[PDB]
């Protein structure tokens with residue numbers, strides 16, 4: 001099954017992973033491949049929230065780094081490092097005061113501008129990379145225009161890694177770099193992910209980059225190829241061992257098939273209703289830690 | 290054998306590679322692994338010039354981007370794009386006029402400064418990344434100091450990819466990014482190489498990054514682990530088919546073992562005599578195209 005590469009990697013970190021200081025069990029250099037013409041790679045062995053994947057992709061793809069967009073969509077994925085940026089502030093005076101942040105940010109323009117904005121997160125690196133001259137570059141923009149024009153280039157690349165920012169910045173991007181490849185009709189993407197939580201993050205990571213490859217294949221009139229997911233250090237926390245173990249006890253079902261609106265073509269102007277997941281039938285979600 | 294991953298990948302592009310416009314046969318997403326504790330990965334099925342590997346590594350590791358250093362070492366690897374930068378010039382008035390470039394550059398300080406210097410090549414990206422403020426960053430410096438200090442970080446990364454330069458620059462780096470990993474005693478490196486000529490470039494690429502992993506393992510008091518070599522688009526030119534084919538007809542021998550001076554410890558101040566290759570016994574070199 002399509003999601004078998006995920007289960008193999010969790011199995012392998014479990015058996016031959018290495019310990020390091022709660023600490024981890026990790027492995028360096030693993031790859032997973034997913035033929036996206038055989039379905040969509042949302043895990044069935046565990047329920048994965050696709051509208052959270054969906055919204056946090058479109059957020060990046062607008063070049064947006066403000067939390068408001070994500071909260072206007074009932075997605076609370078990125079809120080922590082925003083909340084984090086209002087408490088270490090000049091202004092500041094959990095579970096409920098975090099509901100505070102969200103109506104204030106949600107409704108107050110001069111508040112959403114200070115504390116909504118995470119700054120150096122993916123929407124900027126993808127769509128507004130800051131240059132020496134203080135201009136800004138849309139690399140993903142440039143790249144897609146390149147796919148259409150020069151589908152065979154070996155330069156179809158998007159980096160989220162800024163050697164100037166990464167010493168200073170809050171969270172150095174785990175989704176370090178990606179590359180496109182075209183070949184007789186079909187668009188493949190490969191991702192270099194420098195660091196991966198196999199239990200919590202990886203199941204989302206795959207869905208975002210599979211969705212990203214479909215969306216981009218859509219805009220350029222192409223059918224979809226492989227999504228290849230390459231790791232530096234893929235690791236298990238030592239307090240997610242039974243959860244993943246239990247998840248290993250389950251038996252994948254047919255993969256869902258994704259559906260994209262057949263005459264909207266620029267993914268930068270996409271909203272929810274434009275992407276549909278068909279026949280997703282998962283085993284239940286697992287709480288942790 | 291240790292060099293078997295190389296031969297498998299050349300075999301695989303030959304059998305299931307894809308054609309694209311002389312044009313290529315290529316494959317997207319392949320990985321090669323090399324346990325560097327079982328020897329050094331210089332190819333025996335073809336002779337690979339290790340002192341050229343050796344000098345063009347130390348050149349990068351000085352932060353140097355001038356051709357002179359490489360010519361004072363009888364290495365002529367990077368000269369073309371230098372020569373290229375003197376003919377499209379304001380000054381300009383092959384096989385012999387390229388011997389011209391080399392004594393002039395070799396002996397004339399005000400000439401070696403205009404035309405020696407390739408500018409945006411690896412020595413700068415590794416040791417002097419240019420910042421928004423016009424300062425400069427030694428990322429490899431920073432990284433090595435990190436390995437010693439925080440051997441378990443998942444942030445041990447060096448990028449050669451500058452979204453600001455890559456649209457303008459002469460040659461967007463093929464050796465896009467690399468990452469280190471430590472684990473009970475041993476240093477591993479993984480390389481993301483976005484584009485690879487399997488016949489001409491790849492056999493060097495492996496030796497440079499294996500050598501780089503040994504040198505860095507040396508400075509940080511560590512024993513060596515895996516070198517994992519990850520490809521975007523690894524390709525064969527359609528006019529190197531018989532050469533590689535013929536190379537497939539040969540039978541690897543024990544791998545050489547490398548030797549590094551046992552009380553010099555900073556690789557940034559290294560020169561030749563500090564690295565020795567022991568018991569390298571290759572089949573002959575193959576001309577091409």
Ligand SMILES: O=c1ccn([C@H]2C[C@H](O)[C@@H](COP(=O)(O)O)O2)c(=O)[nH]1
Nearest residue numbers: 174195196197198200201202205443
């Ligand atoms: O989208 C994400 C974001 C983060 N991580 C994980 C990888 C690392 O465990 C951790 C980041 O911490 P560092 O490795 O960067 O220190 O979060 C993911 O798997 N997916």
Ligand SMILES: O=c1ccn([C@H]2C[C@H](O)[C@@H](COP(=O)(O)O)O2)c(=O)[nH]1
Nearest residue numbers: 154463484485486487489490491494
């Ligand atoms: O050290 C090197 C430098 C270059 N190449 C190859 C990869 C590509 O074939 C070509 C660069 O051309 P583009 O793919 O960047 O267009 O050179 C290598 O294998 N090793």
Ligand SMILES: Cc1cccc2c1C(=O)N(c1ccnc(Cl)c1)C2=O
Nearest residue numbers: 077078079080081171200201204205
């Ligand atoms: C595990 C996982 C899974 C899916 C999606 C996400 C994460 C995660 O930690 N983050 C995240 C990254 C950086 N900061 C925060 Cl507050 C969250 C995600 O956006």
Ligand SMILES: Cc1cccc2c1C(=O)N(c1ccnc(Cl)c1)C2=O
Nearest residue numbers: 366367368369370460489490493494
């Ligand atoms: C194939 C191979 C093999 C080993 C080493 C090198 C190359 C190559 O094309 N270059 C190179 C890169 C960019 N410009 C030039 Cl003139 C040369 C190398 O440095």
